[PDB]
Curated annotation (Swiss-Prot):
Transmembrane segments: none annotated. The gene is SERF2. Signal peptide: none annotated. Residues 1-30, 50-59 have a biased composition (Basic and acidic residues). This is Small EDRK-rich factor 2. GO terms for cellular component: cytosol; nucleus. GO terms for biological process: protein destabilization. Positive regulator of amyloid protein aggregation and proteotoxicity. Induces conformational changes in amyloid proteins, such as HTT, driving them into compact formations preceding the formation of aggregates.
Length: 59
């Protein structure tokens, strides 16, 4: 917006609201836990990639 207000000094309080309404957090045709496990084991072992964890929120 023309001559839009832009202040460096910004502050955010504890703002966390319910966003769990997404029930479509699974997408496959009909893989059994066996088939999934095997294919996961194939790509991960063949790649030999370390599935590293993102850092937690610290103090």
């Amino acid at each position: 917006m023309t001559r839009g207000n832009q202040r460096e000094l910004a502050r955010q309080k504890n703002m966390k609201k319910q966003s769990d309404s997404v029930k479509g957090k699974r997408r496959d045709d009909g893989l059994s836990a066996a088939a999934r496990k095997q294919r996961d084991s194939e790509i991960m072992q063949q790649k030999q990639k370390k599935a590293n964890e993102k850092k937690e929120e610290p103090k």
